[PDB]
C-alpha cells in the first residue's frame, strides 16, 4: 500500500527515493505503481513538445510547457535542448568541427568532470559502419573520441546480465543475474523480466558503480528509468540535475534506451524498419550534446556510448524441439530460446537422470543446432557455471536458432525476426564502445575488449577505488589521456628449488622401463644447468602466486616448473622456430619412461599406477615429436614430463603436438609454447588446492587434471622470429577439457584433421583465464610496458571472420 495522496511539487525526479507508504517521485516510481497522484502533471509535462521554434524565443515562462524558451531558462537549467540554436544563432554540436579536449573545461564549482553513460540496448557493432549515414552525432563521438571496432559482451548475451556486468565488472555467475529468467533453489524464488520479484535486492550481488560512487562520497544520478518516461524527458532530467548546486549535483549519470533492440526483435538486425530507430537514437545523442553545449559542459563531461549486446536473424521456423529427442519431455523444465537450461520439473522425482537426458541430446541429428553440456564442461572462456542459479544441464544453441521444449510453446506463447543470447564470441552479438571527453584520448582507435573491463575505467574516470571485480585493472589504460591506474606485478609467493643430480637410477621403483665423449658430456651438463634457457623461456619464468613446493628443471629443448605436491609440471616452456623439424617416436622408445635423477622417487609419478588404471593413460607436456636431436629426445621421456591423459584426450593432445604446433610455428615465424595442467573440480574458474581434487590415477596420489592449457606466443611483427622479437607480442591460448570421451565433437570418429582444431578453437582462452586457473603470472620479463602486457593477457583469439 502507498498513500499516493502526497505530492511531487518541487520533488520531480528526486534523487533519494522515499520510504513507504509515502508516495514516490523518483524515476522508478512508475514501475512500482507508487508515484504521487500529481506525478504525470508536474513531472511528465509535454505541452508544446521538445523543441524551441522561432515564435517561442524570449517567451513569457509558462510552467506547463515540457521545456522552455524563455529568457530565464539557462539560469533555471530547463531550456529545450535547441534553445540556443533557434533563439541565439548558436550552432548544433554536431555541426562544430571537433577540437581536441586537452584539459577539462568546466564551470567553477565542478570538482571533477562528470561521467555520462549512454547505453543502447541491442546496438550491434556493425551498426557503426552500416548505419553511419543516418547517425551523424554518434559518428562524431566515434571519430573524435576513443572507439573500439567492437566490444565483447558477456555470456549469455542478454540484457540484464550485460547491463549489470557493465555496472559491476563481474561475470554473471558472480553478480547473480545469470539470465533474463532465473530460479534460485535456496530462496525457492523465481526472477522474471515482467513482475515484482526482480526488485528484491537479494538477486543483485556485487557492488554496482552507483553504490561504489555513493560509498566514496561521489553522488550518482539514478541509472534506471521506468519504460513510460520518454527519452526526451530522461535527457532533460539529466541536464536539470547537472544544473543543481555543487553540493547536490551528481557526478555520474546513466541514460538507457530500449532501442534499437525493441525494433530488432521485430524486424531483424538489418530490416528496412531499422533505419528509423537508429535515426531516433542519434537524435537523442544530439539533444544531450546540444544540451551539454548550452550548459558549457560539452568540453567538460566524459560520455560513454555503450551497447549491451548485438542482434542476430532468428525466426520461428529455426527452432529445434526437445520433444524430437526426449521421451520424458514432461519431466523437465526448460529455460528456452537462444540458450537452453534444463532442470527436473519435480525434485520429488528421483527417476529423473541428467546423464540420460544429455545422452539423448548428443549428436542425434546430422545438422543438430544445439549442443548439450554439463555446465562444468562449457568452454571456460564463458565463465558460466559457479552459481546455484545456473542449471547443471546447458544447451549452447547455434547462432540463428532457437531451442524450445514442444512445438506448442512456439505458436501458443511468426512474431519475431531477431534475437540475441548466443555464445559471446559470435560476431552478431558484438556491441559498441565509444568514449568522448577530456579524460579519453583524441581520435584514437583501440582494439576490441570485453565489457567486464569498463567498471574499472569508470571508477578511474571518477577517482573511485573499484570494488573487487573481474576486469584486469590497467588493461584499458591505453583508452585514457590521464587518470591511468598504475598497477604493479603481483609478488611471487613461492621461490623455486633448482635440484642437481641427487638420486641413483636404482633408488627408483616406479615400474617404468626404457630402452636407453668429452665433447658432448660438457655439452649435456650445461643444458641441465640452463644454457639453452634464454631460447625456451622467452618472457621469464612464470611467478607462482601461492604457497607450494616446486623445482625448476632445465633441458636442451624445454624448461619446466615441476610441482612436488601435484607430481607434475605446473608449466612447461619451449620454443619451436619456423625451421624446426617434426620427427616420430622411435619404435624402441614407444613405452619409454625414465626416472629423473634430480627428483626423488617419493615426489615422482610411477608407471605401475597407469598400468593398473584401465581408464587412464599418460601423455607428455613437451612433445617428443619436436625434440631437437635423437639424443635430446630422451629428455622428453622423463617421468617428470609425464601427465595423466584419458586415451580419448590423447587423440586431441597428440594431434596438437604432432601437427598443430609445427603449423603455427610455420605461420607465425616461430612460437613459444607454455603448456600445463589445470585443476578446477569445483568449476569456480580458480586454481584448486590439493584437498579439492576429486580424482586420482587409480591407487596413487597422482591427481587428474580437469583441463590442459597452452599459451602460444610470437612476434606481432611476423617478419621477426619469435626468439628475436623487438616489439609487441601476439598470443593465442586454449584450455582444453580433459575428458574421457570425445562426445562433444560429433565428428570424432573421423581423422583428427577434421575435428581437433575446431574443438581447440571452441576452447580458446585469455592468458588471464589461465592465470586464475593456475595461480601463475606470465610475461614477467619482457621489454614491454606492464599496461601493454595486461592488454595482451586479456586478449581472446576468437576465430570469427571479419
Ligand atoms: C570474479 O571476481 C569476483 C569478485 O572479486 C570473485 O569472486 C569472489 O571470490 C572469492 C573467493 O571465491 C570470494 O571470497 C569468499 O567470500 C565469502 C564471503 O562472501 C560474502 O561477502 C562478499 C563480500 O561482500 C560478497 O560479495 C558475497 O556475495 C556472494 O554471495 C551472495 C549470496 O550468497 C550473492 O548475492 C553474490 O552474488 C555473491 O555470490 C557469488 O559468490 C559466492 C562466493 O562468495 C558463490 O558461492 C556464488 O555462487 C556466486 O558466484 C558474500 O555475501 C567467504 O565466506 C569465503 O570464505 C571461505 O573460504 C575461505 C578461503 O580463504 C576460508 O579461509 C574461510 O574459512 C571460508 O570458508 C568457510 O566457508 C566455506 C563455504 O561455506 C566452508 O567450506 C568452510 O568450511 C568455512 O566455514 C571467501 O573468502 C568472494 O565472495 C567472491 N565475490 C563475489 C562478489 O563473487 C571471482 O572469483 C572472480 N572470478 C574469476 C574467474 O576470477
Ligand atoms: O526498458 C527496459 N525494458 C523494457 C520493458 C518494457 C518494454 C521495453 C523494454 C529496461 C531494461 C533494462 C534496464 C536497466 C537499466 N540499468 C542500469 C544501467 C546499468 C549499466 C549501464 C546503464 C544503465 C540496468 N542495470 C541492470 C539490469 C537492467 C537495467 C531498464 N531501466 O532503465 O531500468 C529498463
Ligand atoms: Ca538488451
Ligand atoms: Ca577451483
Ligand atoms: Cl535467460
Ligand atoms: Na592405463
Ligand atoms: Na564424438
Ligand atoms: Zn532483446
UniProtKB/Swiss-Prot annotation:
PTM per Swiss-Prot/TrEMBL: N-glycosylation, but not furin-cleavage, plays a critical role on secretion and on lysoPLD activity. The interdomain disulfide bond between Cys-363 and Cys-746 is essential for catalytic activity.
Enzyme active site: 159
EC numbers on record: 3.1.4.39, 3.1.4.4
Residues reported to bind 1-hexadecanoyl-sn-glycero-3-phosphate: 159, 180, 261, 420
GO biological process: cell chemotaxis; cellular response to cadmium ion; cellular response to estradiol stimulus; estrous cycle; immune response; negative regulation of cell-matrix adhesion; phosphatidylcholine catabolic process; phospholipid catabolic process
Main location: secreted
Binding-site residues, Ca(2+): 680, 682, 684, 686, 688
Catalytic activity: a 1-O-alkyl-sn-glycero-3-phosphoethanolamine + H2O = a 1-O-alkyl-sn-glycero-3-phosphate + ethanolamine + H(+); a 1-acyl-sn-glycero-3-phosphoethanolamine + H2O = a 1-acyl-sn-glycero-3-phosphate + ethanolamine + H(+); 1-(9Z-octadecenoyl)-sn-glycero-3-phosphoethanolamine + H2O = 1-(9Z-octadecenoyl)-sn-glycero-3-phosphate + ethanolamine + H(+); a 1-O-alkyl-sn-glycero-3-phosphocholine + H2O = a 1-O-alkyl-sn-glycero-3-phosphate + choline + H(+)
Gene3D superfamilies: 4.10.410.20, Alkaline Phosphatase, subunit A, Extracellular Endonuclease, subunit A
Stretches for region Required for secretion: 770-791
Binding site for 1-(9Z-octadecenoyl)-sn-glycero-3-phosphate: 159, 180, 261, 420
Function field: Secreted lysophospholipase D that hydrolyzes lysophospholipids to produce the signaling molecule lysophosphatidic acid (LPA) in extracellular fluids. Its major substrate is lysophosphatidylcholine. Can also act on sphingosylphosphorylcholine producing sphingosine-1-phosphate, a modulator of cell motility. Can hydrolyze, in vitro, bis-pNPP, to some extent pNP-TMP, and barely ATP. Involved in several motility-related processes such as angiogenesis and neurite outgrowth. Acts as an angiogenic factor by stimulating migration of smooth muscle cells and microtubule formation.
Protein name per the record: Autotaxin
Native source species: Rattus norvegicus (Rat)
Lineage: Eukaryota, Metazoa, Chordata, Craniata, Vertebrata
